[model samples]
Target: KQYIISEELISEGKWVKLEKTTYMDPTGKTRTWESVKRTTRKEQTADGVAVIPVLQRTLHYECIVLVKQFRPPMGGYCIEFPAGLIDDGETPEAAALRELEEETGYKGDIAECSPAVCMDPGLSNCTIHIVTVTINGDDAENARPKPKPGDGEFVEVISLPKNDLLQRLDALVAEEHLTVDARVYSYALALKHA
Candidate 1:
């Protein structure tokens, strides 16, 4: 029922930027919208990379890695996949590996990568690559994981068995007040019945 005409940047900041877009509605009336953007998008094709880490402890005991961190916008803790933005010229797979290692202190193999997908498109211009990571839990180095989070980054790592992910999340919702990211929820639900 509408079409965009022009988008103008209204404000600029270190990490975030604001924009006002002009558009025409079906009624032939002009309208405007306020949008948010990330300043660090930097020449990178994708804004960020999200990892779905599978920790192979045994043939049938594959565990998924999830990260818990405080998200300012949510004003509470959020349970989500390990994720981070890419460097200007970095590939999505490379970013996935680095972010996973930096946040979880465990190195993994990028088993597969998804096409760039929009995240919260209506509110912000954020896109990410959903990557599948394979980690060998038996690896001695992975036994004692130590995160190397950047300044001010405090992340809590978690692992849930693949088949019990949804049940674990339900238990977490009842026991803890943390919110789960949509992507993480979808992943759990999809595999829950499959």
Candidate 2:
């Protein structure tokens, strides 16, 4: 019952803005829904196209891999999992492995992958596939966690014990020193229930 009247582009850059969507709803009423689009989407292939993010665990250390960096939108530091966009013709597992190594400098293999989930349903069409990987114990010692300089990203790797990660993250949130990404925070919370 939703019929779109028109969609106008308002702005364009890293994030593109849609002026408004004028539509008739199922209730037989007119409405407007603003929207935004993320430009860093993965290239499509025969298999599929989507961004893949990782929630990595280090088996050797019994810890979760997290990265701390300044986020412009947040206007502060955010602690999040190592994630990146998938490349052309690349599988989700392959992207997860590559991003894990590039972001954390730790070799790992995909343990499992979650179905692609929408980041913000009401605002944008952004989505990401969450992957869990187990770090290679042999290369644990040489793992240097930092984003490359050329990327304009400065990251510090922090490993939190799975057992106490929630408590630790709560403390950080309470102090307002940092913010945790929803995907990472929600996953840790769910783990406690499991």
Candidate 3:
């Protein structure tokens, strides 16, 4: 997609407002979202990263499960692969391993890394890259120690089988737990469990 700038309207700290030369979209019409401008600092990889780690699986190999908690945003409990933002001077891989331990009190090595993408392309500037990690046993890697939940977080972690996950994907999507199906599918694919 190409956006040609025709005029400048406003310029702020991290934002800019500009008039763009319009073009016909797929609907065969000229459309505009006034002052369309790209995110400034987020264009660099140094901006940030997000990681999703896989926890324990069922004994029968019937499902790969993860701990879930209630999210206050939707006012309910839901399963989300553990995730968080990258810290200063830390690689996405480092952030992935650390977040797994912070969120679940579990520690493990990152198994793989994936390309980064915008979570909400049309609205937000934050970029998210996923790192898949593996944890084993019932030691510190899988125990819940009742840590204080972060802001806007209010849910208990629940483990669900992969089959159950497939069944619940629709509901999760309906409730917005699965923000990007591609991410979820990629997670499952990484474990050979999707």
Best candidate, lDDT-wise?
1
* Candidate 3 worst ten-residue window by lDDT: 35-44
Tens digits of lDDT, candidate 3, 1-194:
55433444444444433443444566566665444444344334534444454455446433333446655556655466666666656777887777666566666667788777776656434566667676664456356545344676543443445545555555656776434235665655554563
For each of the candidates, give the backbone clash count. 0, 0, 5
The residue-by-residue lDDT of candidate 2 on 1-194, one tens digit each, is 67777777777686454567677889998888888766555563212112223334444437787877899989999988877667777787787777766666666766787677777878876667777777654454444544443367576777777777788788878987888988778878986888
Model 3: per-residue Cα lDDT at residue 130: 68
Query: So what's the TM-score on candidate 3?
Result: 0.58
The candidate 2 region of ten consecutive residues with least summed lDDT is: 44-53
lDDT of 3 at 166: 53
Candidate number of the best TM-score: 1
lDDT of 3: 0.55
Worst 10 residues of 1 by lDDT: 55-64
Alpha-carbon local distance difference test for all models: 0.91, 0.68, 0.55
Question: Which runs of model 3 end up more than 4 angstroms from their true locations?
Answer: 1-49, 56-78, 138-155, 168-194
List the RMSD of every prediction in angstroms: 2.0, 3.9, 6.0
Give the alpha carbon lDDT tens digit for every residue of 23-138 in model 1.
89899999988988898987777899999999987555889999999999899999999999998899999999999999999889879999989998878878999999999888
